[PDB]
Every structure is written in structure tokens, then in C-alpha cells.
Design a protein around this motif. Structure first.
Motif, PDB file in Angstrom:
ATOM      1  N   UNK C   3      50.665 107.302 -37.233  1.00 46.00           N
ATOM      2  CA  UNK C   3      50.689 107.667 -38.686  1.00 46.00           C
ATOM      3  C   UNK C   3      51.088 109.370 -38.876  1.00 46.00           C
ATOM      4  N   UNK C   4      50.919 109.891 -37.567  1.00 43.83           N
ATOM      5  CA  UNK C   4      51.148 111.406 -37.725  1.00 43.83           C
ATOM      6  C   UNK C   4      52.361 111.652 -37.133  1.00 43.83           C
ATOM      7  N   UNK C   5      53.063 110.851 -36.280  1.00 44.58           N
ATOM      8  CA  UNK C   5      54.446 111.111 -35.930  1.00 44.58           C
ATOM      9  C   UNK C   5      55.482 111.367 -36.903  1.00 44.58           C
ATOM     10  N   UNK C   6      56.083 112.480 -37.371  1.00 44.01           N
ATOM     11  CA  UNK C   6      57.175 112.687 -37.931  1.00 44.01           C
ATOM     12  C   UNK C   6      58.040 111.603 -38.412  1.00 44.01           C
ATOM     13  N   UNK C   7      58.251 110.736 -37.256  1.00 45.54           N
ATOM     14  CA  UNK C   7      59.415 109.527 -37.314  1.00 45.54           C
ATOM     15  C   UNK C   7      58.951 108.470 -38.142  1.00 45.54           C
ATOM     16  N   UNK C   8      57.402 108.597 -38.752  1.00 47.11           N
ATOM     17  CA  UNK C   8      56.687 108.046 -39.651  1.00 47.11           C
ATOM     18  C   UNK C   8      56.894 108.309 -41.015  1.00 47.11           C
ATOM     19  N   UNK C  11      60.211 107.712 -42.385  1.00 48.67           N
ATOM     20  CA  UNK C  11      60.381 106.420 -42.576  1.00 48.67           C
ATOM     21  C   UNK C  11      59.668 105.948 -43.991  1.00 48.67           C
ATOM     22  N   UNK C  12      58.522 106.614 -44.145  1.00 46.44           N
ATOM     23  CA  UNK C  12      57.799 106.443 -45.392  1.00 46.44           C
ATOM     24  C   UNK C  12      58.430 107.158 -46.607  1.00 46.44           C
ATOM     25  N   UNK C  13      58.906 108.154 -46.367  1.00 47.27           N
ATOM     26  CA  UNK C  13      59.535 109.105 -47.214  1.00 47.27           C
ATOM     27  C   UNK C  13      60.794 108.210 -48.032  1.00 47.27           C
ATOM     28  N   UNK C  14      61.452 107.590 -46.912  1.00 47.35           N
ATOM     29  CA  UNK C  14      62.561 106.776 -47.536  1.00 47.35           C
ATOM     30  C   UNK C  14      62.106 105.549 -48.411  1.00 47.35           C
ATOM     31  N   UNK C  15      61.140 104.815 -47.880  1.00 44.25           N
ATOM     32  CA  UNK C  15      60.717 103.703 -48.767  1.00 44.25           C
ATOM     33  C   UNK C  15      60.076 104.249 -50.032  1.00 44.25           C
ATOM     34  N   UNK C  16      59.284 105.279 -50.035  1.00 36.40           N
ATOM     35  CA  UNK C  16      58.922 105.773 -51.105  1.00 36.40           C
ATOM     36  C   UNK C  16      59.933 106.130 -52.429  1.00 36.40           C
ATOM     37  N   UNK C  17      61.155 106.704 -51.955  1.00 35.23           N
ATOM     38  CA  UNK C  17      62.118 106.984 -52.734  1.00 35.23           C
ATOM     39  C   UNK C  17      62.532 105.376 -53.440  1.00 35.23           C
TER      40      UNK C  17
END
Lengths: 67, 105, 68
Positions: C3-8, C11-17
Motif C-alpha cells: 500500500x506504500x509502493x508508488x506503483x499502488x 493505480x489508485x490515483x487513476x481509479x480515483x479519477x
DNA sequence: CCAGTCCGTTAAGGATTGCGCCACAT
DNA sequence: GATGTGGCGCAATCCTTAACGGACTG
């Protein structure tokens, strides 16, 4: 405190208020969509009537003219 | 294998392909692919025909377009390239995709 | 994954958009629907007024068939 | 063998939605 | 204090699209 029971209960209570608040909102939108289906049906009918009565008026006017 | 690009296409790669098509045309897909790293002609050809071509429309599927597809498909079947000849601006692949997703249901 | 790995976080930023977009699309669709009701309603009152006008006209005409 | 097409197939990623956490409104 | 609302995020999964690979044909 995010693990006590007091907290779990407070959360559950707002979670119910939210589902309830959102059921109301979704309902208002459902009837609003039905209103559209209703009005759209009533308008198609009213437009048929307008066309029918216009044909009637036209035919009758043509009778008085041939008089 | 390890000498093949199967990832995304950079705005850079596309532009090279576009220029290539204006240079020689939609042919010799190998040549341009060579300048590119890890990509063969077949890919360049596909990328062009489906995305980089100017004539390929990118609009939403119109109501009228669906009709044609139904009428056509319920007569020819999965003859995509064929049905695409009845849909100006649409590619064979776009028809296939539209039918297997949307129109399928 | 972490949950800390930037790769996450990405991926979360995209879904939130996408989620904010999708919920905004739905909010517009609802406003439209309500607007659509205002327009159907006006077109409705107009058509009803027209029906009454044509009927009043037909009646005026047929009144010429009455004698004494 | 090579190229240009055609197509089935499916991983990748945007679009939706069920559940909830917060802050703030009433 | 308690309940009502608006905004958001997370995570499951629905829906489309891109394009990999195989089959064919010149």
C-alpha cells in the motif's frame, strides 16, 4: 479510537443513515425517469390527436366551401 | 521473445510511422520497423491501420451504423473486413470489437 | 502489492479519477433528466392548448348546422 | 520463406458500483 | 448528542479496446 466498540457502533449508525439517505435520493431519480416515460407517452398521444383534429377541421372546412 | 516490443506506443514511434506512410505509403512496413527498436513491420501496419490512419473515424457508434451491422452480420456472419466496406471510416477490427462487446448483448 | 509502493499510489490515483468522472457524469445525467421533464411539460401544456383550440373551432363550425 | 490480410482471443485499463470513513449540516 | 448529506476512496468486477498469434493466400 478506531477499534473500540463505541466506535464500531457509531460507524454502523452513520452507515445506516447513509444508505437511507441514498435510497431517498435514488428514488427521487427513479420517479423522475418514469415521469419522462409518462410525458413522452402523453405527448405522442396529444400530437396524434392534434393531427387527427386538424384533418377533421380541414375536411369540414372544405365542406362549407363547396357549399 | 526477448527481442519484441509488446508494450505501449510512444507519441514518438507513431510519428515515425506516420511520416513513413507519407514517404513511401502504407507499404514496406518492414523498413520503418527497422529504425524502430524491438518492433516488426506487421505491428507498424496494425498500429497504423487501426489508430494512426487519418481516415479512421474516432466517433461514437451511431444508431444508423448499428443497423447496417446487424443487417449485414445476420447475412454474412463474422465477415468483418467485408462489413467494414459498408461502414466508411470504421475498421474491420472496430466492427469486430463493437459486435463482441456492445452489440453482443 | 504494498500500500506504500508508488506503483499502488498511481493505480489508485487513476481509479480515483475515473470514479470522480463517473460520478460526475451520473450527476449531469440526473440534472438533464430533470430538465427534460421541464421541456416535456411545456410541450405538453402547448399540445393540450392546441387540442382545445381545434375543438373549439370544430364546434364553432358545426354550430352552423343548427336551425329554427 | 516473406508480406499483406483477416480473425479469434484475451490481457490491460477505464467505467461502475457496493461498502464505508469523514466532516459538517440540521 | 443524534441523525442526515455530500464527497471521496477502496476494491471487486463489468465493459471495451488494443493487438498478439495463427491461418491463408499471392
Amino acid at each position: 479510537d478506531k477499534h473500540s466498540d463505541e466506535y464500531k457502533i457509531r460507524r454502523e449508525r452513520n452507515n445506516i443513515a447513509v444508505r437511507k439517505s441514498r435510497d431517498k435520493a435514488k428514488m427521487r431519480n427513479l420517479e423522475t425517469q418514469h415521469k419522462v416515460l409518462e410525458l413522452t407517452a402523453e405527448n405522442e398521444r396529444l400530437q396524434k390527436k392534434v393531427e387527427q383534429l386538424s384533418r377533421e377541421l380541414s375536411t369540414l372546412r372544405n365542406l362549407f366551401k363547396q357549399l | 521473445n526477448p527481442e519484441l516490443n509488446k508494450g505501449p506506443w510512444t507519441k514518438e514511434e507513431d510519428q515515425r510511422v506516420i511520416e513513413h506512410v507519407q514517404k513511401y505509403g502504407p507499404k514496406r512496413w518492414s523498413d520503418i520497423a527497422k529504425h524502430l527498436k524491438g518492433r516488426i513491420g506487421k505491428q507498424c501496419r496494425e498500429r497504423w491501420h487501426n489508430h494512426l490512419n487519418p481516415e479512421v473515424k474516432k466517433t461514437s457508434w451511431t444508431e444508423e451504423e448499428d443497423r447496417i451491422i446487424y443487417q449485414a452480420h445476420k447475412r454474412l456472419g463474422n465477415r468483418w473486413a467485408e462489413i467494414a466496406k459498408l461502414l466508411p471510416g470504421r475498421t474491420d477490427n472496430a466492427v469486430k470489437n463493437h459486435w463482441n462487446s456492445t452489440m453482443r448483448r
